Write a protein that holds these residues in place. Structure first.
Motif, PDB file in Angstrom:
ATOM      1  N   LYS A 114       0.723  -1.430  -0.071  1.00  0.00           N
ATOM      2  CA  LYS A 114       0.061   0.097   0.078  1.00  0.00           C
ATOM      3  C   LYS A 114       0.915   1.289  -0.104  1.00  0.00           C
ATOM      4  N   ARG A 115       0.280   2.291  -0.701  1.00  0.00           N
ATOM      5  CA  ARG A 115       1.040   3.617  -0.629  1.00  0.00           C
ATOM      6  C   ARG A 115       0.065   4.627  -0.212  1.00  0.00           C
ATOM      7  N   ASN A 116       0.626   5.749   0.423  1.00  0.00           N
ATOM      8  CA  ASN A 116      -0.343   6.590   1.428  1.00  0.00           C
ATOM      9  C   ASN A 116       0.285   8.044   1.221  1.00  0.00           C
ATOM     10  N   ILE A 117      -0.810   8.707   0.960  1.00  0.00           N
ATOM     11  CA  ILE A 117      -0.468  10.501   1.077  1.00  0.00           C
ATOM     12  C   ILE A 117      -1.121  10.727   2.334  1.00  0.00           C
ATOM     13  N   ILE A 118      -0.552  11.749   3.009  1.00  0.00           N
ATOM     14  CA  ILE A 118      -1.239  12.387   4.002  1.00  0.00           C
ATOM     15  C   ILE A 118      -1.236  14.039   3.901  1.00  0.00           C
ATOM     16  N   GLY A 119      -2.489  14.491   4.177  1.00  0.00           N
ATOM     17  CA  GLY A 119      -2.480  16.115   4.143  1.00  0.00           C
ATOM     18  C   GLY A 119      -2.645  16.860   5.306  1.00  0.00           C
ATOM     19  N   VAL A 135      -8.220  16.401  -5.402  1.00  0.00           N
ATOM     20  CA  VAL A 135      -7.296  15.282  -5.948  1.00  0.00           C
ATOM     21  C   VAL A 135      -7.415  14.029  -5.348  1.00  0.00           C
ATOM     22  N   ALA A 136      -7.432  13.742  -4.281  1.00  0.00           N
ATOM     23  CA  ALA A 136      -8.043  12.566  -3.554  1.00  0.00           C
ATOM     24  C   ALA A 136      -9.155  12.056  -4.349  1.00  0.00           C
ATOM     25  N   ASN A 137     -10.168  13.115  -4.699  1.00  0.00           N
ATOM     26  CA  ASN A 137     -11.399  12.481  -5.262  1.00  0.00           C
ATOM     27  C   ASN A 137     -11.197  11.799  -6.685  1.00  0.00           C
ATOM     28  N   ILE A 138     -10.210  12.257  -7.371  1.00  0.00           N
ATOM     29  CA  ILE A 138      -9.833  11.635  -8.464  1.00  0.00           C
ATOM     30  C   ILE A 138      -8.904  10.472  -8.305  1.00  0.00           C
ATOM     31  N   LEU A 139      -8.140  10.451  -7.379  1.00  0.00           N
ATOM     32  CA  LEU A 139      -7.011   9.491  -7.171  1.00  0.00           C
ATOM     33  C   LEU A 139      -7.121   8.346  -6.261  1.00  0.00           C
ATOM     34  N   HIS A 140      -8.274   8.342  -5.604  1.00  0.00           N
ATOM     35  CA  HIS A 140      -8.513   7.556  -4.740  1.00  0.00           C
ATOM     36  C   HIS A 140      -8.366   5.971  -4.875  1.00  0.00           C
ATOM     37  N   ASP A 141      -8.119   5.512  -5.992  1.00  0.00           N
ATOM     38  CA  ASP A 141      -8.007   4.138  -6.543  1.00  0.00           C
ATOM     39  C   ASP A 141      -6.726   3.779  -6.662  1.00  0.00           C
ATOM     40  N   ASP A 142      -5.647   4.695  -6.669  1.00  0.00           N
ATOM     41  CA  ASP A 142      -4.359   4.488  -6.799  1.00  0.00           C
ATOM     42  C   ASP A 142      -3.645   4.737  -5.638  1.00  0.00           C
ATOM     43  N   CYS A 143      -4.132   5.534  -4.723  1.00  0.00           N
ATOM     44  CA  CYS A 143      -3.467   5.849  -3.203  1.00  0.00           C
ATOM     45  C   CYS A 143      -4.580   5.977  -2.181  1.00  0.00           C
ATOM     46  N   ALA A 144      -3.972   5.680  -1.224  1.00  0.00           N
ATOM     47  CA  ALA A 144      -4.832   6.237   0.132  1.00  0.00           C
ATOM     48  C   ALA A 144      -4.461   7.627   0.607  1.00  0.00           C
ATOM     49  N   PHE A 145      -5.313   8.199   0.814  1.00  0.00           N
ATOM     50  CA  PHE A 145      -5.408   9.574   1.211  1.00  0.00           C
ATOM     51  C   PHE A 145      -5.940   9.809   2.697  1.00  0.00           C
ATOM     52  N   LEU A 146      -5.013  10.586   3.490  1.00  0.00           N
ATOM     53  CA  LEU A 146      -5.420  10.863   5.017  1.00  0.00           C
ATOM     54  C   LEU A 146      -5.346  12.430   5.140  1.00  0.00           C
ATOM     55  N   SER A 147      -6.052  12.724   6.121  1.00  0.00           N
ATOM     56  CA  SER A 147      -6.284  14.226   6.663  1.00  0.00           C
ATOM     57  C   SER A 147      -6.007  14.291   8.283  1.00  0.00           C
ATOM     58  N   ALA A 148      -5.212  15.081   8.588  1.00  0.00           N
ATOM     59  CA  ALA A 148      -4.831  15.466  10.013  1.00  0.00           C
ATOM     60  C   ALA A 148      -5.416  17.131  10.229  1.00  0.00           C
ATOM     61  N   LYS A 186       3.649  10.237  -7.727  1.00  0.00           N
ATOM     62  CA  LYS A 186       4.059   9.400  -6.574  1.00  0.00           C
ATOM     63  C   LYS A 186       2.949   8.012  -6.712  1.00  0.00           C
ATOM     64  N   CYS A 187       1.941   8.245  -7.201  1.00  0.00           N
ATOM     65  CA  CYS A 187       1.046   7.173  -7.362  1.00  0.00           C
ATOM     66  C   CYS A 187       0.950   6.154  -8.608  1.00  0.00           C
ATOM     67  N   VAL A 188       1.194   6.709  -9.792  1.00  0.00           N
ATOM     68  CA  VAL A 188       1.004   5.957 -10.886  1.00  0.00           C
ATOM     69  C   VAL A 188       2.468   5.858 -11.395  1.00  0.00           C
ATOM     70  N   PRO A 189       3.178   4.679 -11.095  1.00  0.00           N
ATOM     71  CA  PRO A 189       4.713   4.368 -11.396  1.00  0.00           C
ATOM     72  C   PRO A 189       4.970   4.288 -12.960  1.00  0.00           C
ATOM     73  N   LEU A 190       5.816   4.404 -13.373  1.00  0.00           N
ATOM     74  CA  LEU A 190       6.381   4.562 -14.670  1.00  0.00           C
ATOM     75  C   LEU A 190       5.908   3.303 -15.501  1.00  0.00           C
ATOM     76  N   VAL A 191       6.129   2.217 -14.729  1.00  0.00           N
ATOM     77  CA  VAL A 191       5.566   0.808 -15.459  1.00  0.00           C
ATOM     78  C   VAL A 191       4.510   0.299 -14.645  1.00  0.00           C
ATOM     79  N   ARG A 192       3.329   0.426 -14.880  1.00  0.00           N
ATOM     80  CA  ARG A 192       2.038   0.039 -14.309  1.00  0.00           C
ATOM     81  C   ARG A 192       1.763  -1.545 -14.389  1.00  0.00           C
ATOM     82  N   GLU A 193       0.908  -1.885 -13.110  1.00  0.00           N
ATOM     83  CA  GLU A 193       0.532  -3.063 -13.175  1.00  0.00           C
ATOM     84  C   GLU A 193      -0.581  -3.395 -14.342  1.00  0.00           C
ATOM     85  N   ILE A 194      -0.782  -4.221 -15.081  1.00  0.00           N
ATOM     86  CA  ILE A 194      -1.725  -4.767 -15.808  1.00  0.00           C
ATOM     87  C   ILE A 194      -2.672  -6.022 -15.117  1.00  0.00           C
TER      88      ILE A 194
END
Length: 328
Positions: A114-119, A135-148, A186-194
């Protein structure tokens, strides 16, 4: 709500979330969908501008269709704030699937501490968070977003588990394009998993595939493909999709090139017309090779002779003519 030239820009630019059915009258699948879309909109009035359902008669508004890159009928586009989402609703064509989807899309997505962004934010009632939320609204499937919030502003990217250092966002947090692009990098790596889950989307990007097939635990191979692609093909990322797949799950593509998971790691191209084999894996280290491999797809050199190459396997992941009228 039938969009047209006159009213489109208003409705979409202001809609928090818009589901748009680009259809045609003469389309069997479209005609099937019309009453499903209709019912789900009725059901989604458990809201109250928040979520609007709309349709486009691509035959009446050819200008509109050409600009949302409609590749088939019926296409279901999601818009947020009048920006089109890259991901389409590709699921089951039922009232429930639909209304669930939208519910999903309207949901959370960010958990407040798992990979995590936090704001980090002074106030949820501030520009920066609005931008993060978007952003999190767009990218929630590629990353986990957190708020403090509060004491007890910043964006930190926490990568794959321990023994890998935090990365801090240095850009303007009120600037959505930049914030979006940083997180997206940071979410979408250069070589993605299919996977089958995402395969269809990947096909609709319209690029041939360069794929590493590999044995899930074998990561020695992924990593070396990883930076060979990075070191050799960056100049060609707009011509080809760099991907990796797990052999067991994709034994069928491997049948096409007369390979088994035994032979893995295997590097192939799937152009959507044919499949081509790189050769020895360890050949990836040879300076010219990987790049030449890509070059040759594009020059027609691979085709040539070798008497006709094997068919694409990945074309079956592409949208079906049993589910859509397909536009060329």
């Amino acid at each position: 709500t039938s969009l047209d030239t006159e009213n489109i820009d208003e409705i979409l630019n202001n809609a928090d979330v818009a589901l748009v059915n680009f259809y045609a009258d003469w389309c069997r699948f479209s005609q099937m969908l019309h009453p499903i879309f209709e019912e789900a909109s009725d059901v989604i009035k458990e809201e109250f501008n928040q979520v609007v359902f709309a349709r486009v008669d691509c035959d009446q508004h050819s200008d509109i269709a050409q600009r949302y890159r409609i590749s088939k009928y019926p296409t279901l586009k999601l818009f947020r704030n009048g920006m089109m989402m890259k991901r389409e609703y590709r699921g089951q064509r039922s009232v429930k699937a639909l209304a669930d989807y939208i519910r999903q899309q309207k949901s959370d997505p960010i958990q407040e501490i798992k990979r995590n962004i936090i704001g980090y934010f002074e106030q949820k009632d501030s520009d920066n968070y609005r931008v993060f939320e978007r952003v999190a609204n767009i990218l929630h499937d590629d990353c986990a977003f957190l708020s403090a919030f509060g004491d007890v502003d910043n964006i930190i990217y926490k990568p794959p588990g321990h023994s890998a250092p935090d990365m801090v966002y240095l850009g303007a947090m009120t600037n959505f394009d930049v914030t979006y692009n940083w997180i997206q990098d940071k979410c979408v790596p250069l070589v993605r998993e299919i996977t089958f889950e995402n395969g269809e989307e990947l096909t609709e990007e319209g690029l041939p595939f360069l794929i590493l097939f590999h044995m899930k635990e074998d990561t020695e191979s992924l990593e070396i493909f990883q930076n060979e692609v990075a070191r050799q093909l960056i100049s060609e990322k707009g011509t080809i999709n760099f991907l990796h797949a797990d052999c067991d799950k994709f034994r069928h593509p491997l049948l096409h090139i007369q390979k088994t998971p035994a032979d893995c790691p295997v590097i192939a191209i799937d152009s959507f017309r044919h499949m081509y084999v790189f050769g020895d894996f360890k050949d990836v280290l040879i300076p010219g090779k990987l790049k030449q491999f890509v070059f040759d797809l594009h020059s027609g050199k691979l085709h040539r002779e070798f008497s006709s190459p094997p068919e694409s396997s990945f074309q079956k992941l592409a949208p079906s003519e049993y589910r859509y009228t397909l536009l060329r």
